[PDB]
Design a protein around this nucleic acid. Sequence first.
RNA 1: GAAGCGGCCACACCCGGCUGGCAACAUCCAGCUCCACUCCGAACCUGGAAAUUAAGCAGUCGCGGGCCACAUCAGUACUGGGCUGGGCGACUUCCCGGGAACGUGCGGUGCUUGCUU
Length: 175
Amino acid sequence: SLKQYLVIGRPYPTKEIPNPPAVRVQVFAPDEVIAKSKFWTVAQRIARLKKAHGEVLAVKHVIEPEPTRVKNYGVWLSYRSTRNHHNVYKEYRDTTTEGAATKMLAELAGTHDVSADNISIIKIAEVADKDLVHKNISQFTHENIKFPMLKQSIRAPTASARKVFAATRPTVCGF
RNA sequence: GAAGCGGCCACACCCGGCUGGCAACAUCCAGCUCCACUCCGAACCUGGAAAUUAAGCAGUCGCGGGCCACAUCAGUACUGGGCUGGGCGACUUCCCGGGAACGUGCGGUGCUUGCUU
C-alpha cells in the first residue's frame, strides 16, 4: 500500500556553482524505489531538474506520530479528463494521510473514472472540526451518532468452517 | 603611434557627430616624353611640391540599425524506446531516454603575425 515519503534532491556541482539549491517533494508510493521515480517526475516537470544530472539525497519515510486515533483530511487535487482539467477540494476521515490518499484514488476511479496517471495532488493536510466544511463528514464529528448495521454478512467465521447447505434460513436483517 | 605585407574574415559592416597630423599615408599641384582616354590628364600613367587635416585614414561618442556573446524562453515544441494504457475515431495520458527555435533581458563593438623609421 502507499506510504508517505519526503524526497530531497539536487543537481550536481558545476564549477560555476558548487552547493546549489536542493528541492523536496512529498510523494505517495508503495516503496522507496517508486518514490524516487515520482520525485524525478515532479522535479523535471516543474523545477527543471533531470535524472541524468542530479543527486537524490534522502528518501525519508514519514510514519505517523499516532495512528491510534481518527483525523479529518482535506485533499486539494487536480484531475484531468479528456478535453478539460478540473480542480476539486475533497476531504476524508481516516487514521493517516496515506489511507486518505488511498481512499481518493479509489473514489476518483469510482465516481469520475480517472486513473492515478491523470491525477495530480496539490495539498494534503489534517484539518480541525471548526474549519471543516462538508456535510457528510461533519456528521461523524458530532456526538450521539447511531447508525444500524442493516444488511449483515454471511461469511465463514473461519475459512475452515464454510458450508454450502443449511437447515435453518439465515437472517440478514440489521438486527 | 604610422607604413608596406598579411591571418581569422562584420566584436571588423552601414548612417551620423567630435578630436588629432613630427615623420608616414593622403588629399592636392602640373602635363613634356613612357602610355591614357570607343570624347575628356576625371580615371590610368608620369613629374611635383605650394598649403591644409575639410575628406579618406586613425582614435572616440550614440537609451543608433545590424553583427557577436551569455542567461532566460523551456523541461515548453518536437522526438527514440514500452504498455491486453485511454479513445467510435481523430489523436493522446503515463513509464525509461534525448531536447530545440523565435522572442525578451542584459553586455560587448576588433584581437596581433613577420620587416621598417
